[PDB]
C-alpha cells in the first residue's frame, strides 16, 4: 500500500518520501472458516468466551467487573485499560527523521531485526525531491556510511529505530529501511569458544577431506566471464511450497 511522509535530516530541511514494503513473509488471504459437521453452515456455532471466578462458578460480566492487571514480582497490580491510555507513551507525530550517520562497520550482518523491509522513495511527481534524494543516496554510495533513523508508520503505533542501508541498480537508487534492536532486544552469551581445539581435534586428514567437500558440492558454477556464476538454484524465484 502507498504511505506518504517527509524524510527529515534536520529541523528545517524536509524532503517528501513515500516508502513501499518490499519483502514481507507472506500469509494466505482466506482463513479456515468453522463449520458444523452435518449441516455444513458457517454460522451454526457461537463462540462463548465465558468467565469464571473460582469460588464455585460465579460468572462475571466483562462490561462491568473485569479489569486488566500487569504482574510485578511476587504480586499482581491492577491498572485500568482506561488509565494505561492516560499514562502510555504517545508519539507526537507520524514521524520519519534521521538521527545521524556511521560506517558499514558499525552494523554487522547478524543483528538485523525486522518484520519487513521498506523501499523508501522520492514522492510521485516531486522533481525537487527526485534531485534531493538522488543526491542523498549518491552521497552515501561512496563513503560506506549508513543512516540511523527514528520511524513510525502512524499515530499510537510504537516508535521505531534503525538502519537505512543504500545500494544501486542501473534504473534507480536503492535505500532500504530496516529495524535494529534496542538494548533489551539483544542477547549476550559467552558460547564456549571453539579455537581452544585440544579436546575436539580437527586433524590433518579430516581437514584434507572437507577441503574437497565445499568446492565439490558448489551450486554456483563459474560458466561465465561477467564474474557472476550460473545461479544454478535461484531460490528467490521459487514459489512458496506451502501455497502450492
Amino acid at each position: 500500500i502507498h504511505w506518504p511522509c517527509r524524510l527529515t535530516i534536520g529541523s528545517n530541511l524536509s524532503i517528501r518520501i513515500a516508502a513501499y514494503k518490499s519483502i514481507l513473509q507472506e500469509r494466505v488471504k482466506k482463513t479456515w472458516t468453522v463449520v458444523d459437521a452435518k449441516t455444513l453452515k458457517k454460522e451454526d456455532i457461537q463462540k462463548e468466551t465465558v468467565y469464571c471466578l473460582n469460588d464455585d462458578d460465579e460468572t462475571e460480566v466483562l462490561k462491568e467487573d473485569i479489569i486488566q492487571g500487569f504482574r510485578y514480582g511476587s504480586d499482581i497490580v491492577p491498572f485500568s485499560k482506561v488509565d494505561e491510555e492516560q499514562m502510555k507513551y504517545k508519539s507526537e507525530g507520524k514521524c520519519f527523521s534521521v538521527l545521524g550517520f556511521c560506517k558499514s562497520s558499525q552494523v554487522q550482518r547478524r543483528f538485523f531485526m525486522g518484520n519487513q523491509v521498506l523501499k523508501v522513495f522520492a514522492a510521485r511527481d516531486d522533481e525537487a525531491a527526485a534531485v534531493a534524494l538522488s543526491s542523498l543516496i549518491h552521497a552515501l554510495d561512496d563513503l560506506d556510511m549508513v543512516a540511523i533513523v527514528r520511524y513510525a508508520y502512524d499515530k499510537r503505533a510504537n516508535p521505531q529505530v534503525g538502519v537505512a542501508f543504500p545500494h544501486i541498480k542501473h534504473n534507480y537508487e536503492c535505500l532500504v529501511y530496516v529495524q535494529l534492536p534496542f538494548m533489551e532486544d539483544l542477547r549476550q552469551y559467552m558460547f564456549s569458544s571453539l579455537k581452544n581445539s585440544k579436546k575436539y581435534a580437527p586433524t590433518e586428514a579430516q581437514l584434507n577431506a572437507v577441503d574437497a567437500l565445499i568446492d565439490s558440492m558448489s551450486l554456483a558454477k563459474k560458466d561465465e566471464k561477467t564474474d557472476t556464476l550460473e545461479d544454478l538454484f535461484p531460490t528467490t524465484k521459487i514459489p512458496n511450497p506451502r501455497f502450492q
Binding site: 518490499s22 538521527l99 577441503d211
Partner: protein, 497 residues
C-alpha cells in the same frame, strides 16, 4: 552454572549508632545509603528477575528475630521471591524521620559478633528448598576493625567465614566512607576474595537498569542431514529477539482476584456444547464450499521431519543483503546427541571461511512446519577486547525470501543529481558522522511502561517520566550541521516551498 539455579542474595546492614546516625557532611547517611541500595537493587531485580531470591538482615540491633544464635540480630526479611510489600517494608526506615522510626522498634548501638552474624545468614540459606546457582552475602558496615579487640573473638569470625567460603557460599563487601579512613588491609583482607574514599563498585547498584535477563537456553535441537545418512546435532539459539510488555492478567474488579477466561463453543440453534470432533474446518472458492477435518488443516502444511538438509554451496556476494526475511538465529554444536560431531562441525567452520563460502540448507524447526531456505554464513570471534567475546564463533542462519514474499513496487525512473549536488551532500554527511553501537538505544514505550507500573505498584507520588533517547536532539542538529540546509534550498530547488 546449570540452567535452573536461582541467583540468591542477602543484604546485611550494620545497625550500630556510630555509623547508623552518623555523617561528616549532612548530605547523605550510611544507613540511608545502604537502605537506598537495598531498595534499588531490589527494584532492579523485580523488573528483571522475579525468580531470583532476596533477604535483608540487621545485625547489632537491640530487639531480636532469628531461628537461633539470637543475640543482637534481627532478620527484617527471610529469603523470598521479590515484590512490592517487601519494598514497602524497607521504605518505612528511610530518611531523617526514618532513623527515628527504626529506633522505636529494634534499638541502636549495642554489641555484636560477626561469627554469630555469619552463622545466622548460613542458617538462612540452608532453610530454603530451591536450587541456587550463586549464593552471595553483601556487607553494609563501615566498621573496618569489626571490634576484633578480642583477637579470640575475631578468630571465630575468620574461621566461620573460612567455613562460609568452604561451603561455596560467597561473601562480598562495600565500604561506606568512614570519617578519616577505611583500610581493608587492617581487617576484611581475608574475609573477601591501597586505601579508599568510598567504593567505585557501589554506584553500579544505583544503575536502576531494566530489561528481562533470560539465561542461555536452546530454541530447539536439530540434525544437519548432509545427505540420506550423515548427521550432526546442532543447537539453534536466539541472539536477537524483540521483547514485549509482559502479558496482562485479567482480574475481578471487586476483590482484585485473578479470573479464568473459560471459553466454549455453543450451537447457535441448541444446547450442544460442541466437542472438537463435532466441527470441521472449511473454505469458500468458486461459489462452492470445501470441507476438511481438524486433523488434516494441519496435515496440509506438512512436508518433513525436524532437521536441516544440506543443499550445496554459494559465493557470499550473491547472498544479496537487500532481501531479508526474519531475525537471524545462531547455530552451535551439541554433543548432547551425535557424540564427536563437534569434530566435523569445527572443520566445516574453519574451511568455509577460507573458501569465502556459504552452505545453503532447508530448515524445519518442528514437525508440521514447511521448510524455509537458509544460508549458513560462517563466523569468527573478536576476543581482542580482553576476551569480552562481542561475537561467538559458529554459523548464522540467515533466511532467504521466496517469490511470493518479494512484493511488486511501482514504476519510477531518474538519474538526476549533478556532481555539485552530491558534492554539498558529501559535506553535510561528513559533519553528521557519529558511532552507532548496538546497545546505544532503548525502547521508549517499554522503558516508560515500567516507570508507570512502579508508580502504581510501590504507590509512588509520581511517574518518573524519564525522557527517551530516540528523538533527534534538534538544537545540536541545528548547530553541528550549521546553516547548510540552505545549500539544498538555493542550489537544488526553487523558492516556492
Amino acid at each position: 552454572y546449570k540452567y535452573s539455579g536461582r541467583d540468591s542474595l542477602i543484604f546485611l546492614v550494620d545497625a550500630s549508632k556510630a555509623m547508623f546516625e552518623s555523617q561528616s557532611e549532612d548530605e547523605l547517611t550510611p544507613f540511608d545509603m545502604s537502605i537506598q541500595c537495598i531498595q534499588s537493587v531490589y527494584i532492579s531485580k523485580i523488573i528483571s528477575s522475579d525468580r531470583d531470591l532476596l533477604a535483608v538482615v540487621f545485625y547489632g540491633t537491640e530487639k531480636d528475630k532469628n531461628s537461633v544464635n539470637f543475640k543482637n540480630i534481627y532478620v527484617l526479611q527471610e529469603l523470598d521471591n521479590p515484590g512490592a510489600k517487601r519494598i514497602l517494608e524497607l521504605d518505612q526506615f528511610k530518611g531523617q524521620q526514618g532513623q527515628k522510626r527504626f529506633q522505636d522498634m529494634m534499638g541502636h548501638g549495642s554489641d555484636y559478633s560477626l561469627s554469630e552474624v555469619l552463622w545466622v545468614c548460613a542458617n538462612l540459606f540452608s532453610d530454603v528448598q530451591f536450587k541456587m546457582s550463586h549464593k552471595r552475602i553483601m556487607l553494609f558496615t563501615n566498621e573496618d576493625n569489626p571490634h576484633g579487640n578480642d583477637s579470640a573473638k575475631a578468630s571465630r569470625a575468620r574461621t566461620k567465614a573460612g567455613d562460609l567460603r568452604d561451603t561455596g557460599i560467597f561473601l562480598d563487601l562495600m565500604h561506606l566512607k568512614k570519617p578519616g579512613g577505611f583500610d581493608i588491609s587492617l581487617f576484611y583482607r581475608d574475609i573477601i576474595s591501597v586505601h579508599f574514599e568510598e567504593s567505585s563498585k557501589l554506584e553500579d547498584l544505583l544503575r536502576k537498569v531494566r530489561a528481562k535477563e533470560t539465561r542461555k537456553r536452546a530454541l530447539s535441537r536439530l540434525k544437519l542431514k548432509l545427505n540420506k545418512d550423515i548427521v550432526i546435532s546442532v543447537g539453534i539459539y536466539n541472539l536477537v529477539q524483540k521483547a514485549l510488555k509482559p502479558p496482562p492478567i485479567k482480574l475481578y474488579r471487586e476483590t482484585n482476584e485473578p479470573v479464568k477466561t473459560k471459553t466454549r463453543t455453543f450451537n447457535t440453534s441448541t444446547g450442544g456444547l460442541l466437542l472438537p470432533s463435532d466441527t470441521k474446518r472449511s473454505q469458500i472458492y468458486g461459489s462452492r464450499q470445501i470441507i476438511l477435518e481438524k486433523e488434516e488443516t494441519e496435515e496440509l502444511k506438512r512436508f518433513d521431519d525436524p532437521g536441516l538438509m544440506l543443499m550445496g554451496f554459494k559465493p557470499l556476494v550473491l547472498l544479496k543483503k537487500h532481501h531479508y526475511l526474519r531475525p537471524s538465529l545462531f547455530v552451535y554444536p551439541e554433543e548432547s546427541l551425535v557424540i564427536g560431531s563437534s569434530t566435523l562441525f569445527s572443520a566445516l567452520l574453519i574451511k568455509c571461511l577460507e573458501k569465502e563460502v556459504a552452505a545453503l540448507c532447508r530448515y524445519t524447526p518442528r514437525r508440521n512446519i514447511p521448510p524455509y531456505f537458509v544460508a549458513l554464513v560462517p563466523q569468527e570471534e573478536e576476543l581482542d577486547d580482553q576476551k569480552i567475546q562481542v561475537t561467538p564463533p559458529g554459523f548464522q542462519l540467515v533466511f532467504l525470501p521466496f517469490a511470493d514474499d518479494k512484493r511488486k513496487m511501482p514504476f519510477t525512473e531518474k538519474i538526476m543529481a549533478t556532481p555539485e549536488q552530491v558534492g554539498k551532500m558529501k559535506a553535510i554527511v561528513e559533519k553528521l558522522r557519529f558511532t552507532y553501537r548496538s546497545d546505544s538505544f532503548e525502547n521508549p514505550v517499554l522503558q516508560q511502561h515500567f516507570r508507570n507500573l512502579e508508580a502504581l505498584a510501590l504507590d509512588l507520588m509520581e511517574p518518573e517520566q524519564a525522557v527517551d533517547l530516540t528523538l533527534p536532539k534538534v538544537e545540536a542538529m541545528n548547530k553541528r550541521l550549521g546553516s547548510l540546509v540552505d545549500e539544498f534550498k538555493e542550489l537544488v530547488y526553487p523558492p516556492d516551498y
